[PDB]
Amino acid sequence: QNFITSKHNIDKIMTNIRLNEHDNIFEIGSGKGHFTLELVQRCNFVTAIEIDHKLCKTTENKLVDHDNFQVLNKDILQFKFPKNQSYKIFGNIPYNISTDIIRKIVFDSIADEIYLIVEYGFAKRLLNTKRSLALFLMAEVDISILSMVPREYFHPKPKVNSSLIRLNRKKSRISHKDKQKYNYFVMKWVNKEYKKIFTKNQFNNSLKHAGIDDLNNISFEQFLSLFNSYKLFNK
């Protein structure tokens, strides 16, 4: 629900999306095909993943004059993305499953660049180093809010505005080796269960060592410093 159908608005949004003629794209949710139509004209090939079969049909009808696409009536959460292919993602996604979609495409796909339209508050949370999802994502991708999408652009009109965000894949900051240890550290840190990860002395030394003077506001680099100190203290 909450589709964007004004061509005028669609163009303004596409203006911030820098996908090119040679990129293969996976669209999360096709809606009635309003963005799908733009993507196929802009990009090399588009694979739209849509759970609702009627929408798949509508999208298909809207793109009748295009050949560089396919619509798959599947569940994004169960979809298996390519493993030896360069591709990007775009998605005007539902708030209710935003968290699951993003973990799915960031942790279970190798898309090197992802463009998503999410609620304004959700987007802000993804950059908040006090939250676990943000800390897990920042180890795999860089995140940036590109523009604000007014709720008037949607229908039904949501009660809050949205944001167009971009996630860029980068070399993981956490080795596959420190996976479990990182997951534990993140959770205990966001829950402020400091005692389970640092003795009082290690805690203070780690903070000064990371240059953190205000616990209520730490950069991701500072958090990584903390995780590194955590590793050192524990063999």
Swiss-Prot record:
GO terms for molecular function: 23S rRNA (adenine(2085)-N(6))-dimethyltransferase activity; RNA binding; rRNA (adenine-N6,N6-)-dimethyltransferase activity. InterPro entries: KsgA/Erm (IPR001737), rRNA_Ade_diMease-like_C (IPR023165), rRNA_Ade_Mease_Trfase_CS (IPR020596), rRNA_Ade_methylase_Trfase_N (IPR020598), SAM-dependent_MTases_sf (IPR029063). Changing K124A: Reduces activity by about 80%. Changing Y95A: Loss of activity. Its EC number is 2.1.1.184. GO terms for biological process: response to antibiotic. Changing R131A: Decreases affinity for S-adenosyl-L-methionine 7-fold. Reduces activity by about 85%. S-adenosyl-L-methionine binds at N2, I4, G29, E50, D75, N92. GO terms for cellular component: cytosol. The keyword RNA-binding applies. PROSITE patterns: RRNA_A_DIMETH, SAM_RNA_A_N6_MT. Changing R125A: Decreases affinity for S-adenosyl-L-methionine 7-fold. Decreases affinity for RNA about 4-fold. Reduces activity by over 99%. May severely impair protein folding. Keywords: Antibiotic resistance, Methyltransferase, Plasmid, RNA-binding, S-adenosyl-L-methionine, Transferase. It comes from the Bacteria. Belongs to the class I-like SAM-binding methyltransferase superfamily. rRNA adenine N(6)-methyltransferase family. PANTHER family: DIMETHYLADENOSINE TRANSFERASE, DIMETHYLADENOSINE TRANSFERASE-RELATED. This protein produces a dimethylation of the adenine residue at position 2085 in 23S rRNA, resulting in reduced affinity between ribosomes and macrolide-lincosamide-streptogramin B antibiotics. This is rRNA adenine N-6-methyltransferase.
